[PDB]
Amino acid sequence: MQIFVKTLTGKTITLEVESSDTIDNVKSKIQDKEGIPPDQQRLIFAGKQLEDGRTLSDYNIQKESTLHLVLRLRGG
Partner 1 sequence: IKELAVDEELEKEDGLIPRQKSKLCKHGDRGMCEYCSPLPPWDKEYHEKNKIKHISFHSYLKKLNENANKKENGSSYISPLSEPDFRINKRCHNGHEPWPRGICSKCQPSAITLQQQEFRMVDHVEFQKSEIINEFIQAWRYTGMQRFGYMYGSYSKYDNTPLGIKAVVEAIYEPPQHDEQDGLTMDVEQVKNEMLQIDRQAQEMGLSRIGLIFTDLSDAGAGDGSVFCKRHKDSFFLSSLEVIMAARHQTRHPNVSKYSEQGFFSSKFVTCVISGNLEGEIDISSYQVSTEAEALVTADMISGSTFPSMAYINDTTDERYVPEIFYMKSNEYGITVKENAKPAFPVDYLLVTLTHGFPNTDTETNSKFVSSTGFPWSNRQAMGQSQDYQELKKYLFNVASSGDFNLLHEKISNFHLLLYINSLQILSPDEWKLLIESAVKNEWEESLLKLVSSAGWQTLVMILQESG
| Positions that interact with partner 1 (CB under 8 A) | 7-11, 36, 40, 42, 44-49, 68, 70-73, 75-76
Measuring CA to CA, which residue among 65, 73, 3, 16 is closest to residue 42? 73
Query: Shortest gap between Cβ of 48 and partner 1 (angstroms)?
Result: 7
Query: Shortest gap between Cβ of 72 and partner 1 (angstroms)?
Result: 5
HSE-CB for 15 with a 13 A CA cutoff: 25
Query: Shortest gap between Cβ of 10 and partner 1 (angstroms)?
Result: 5
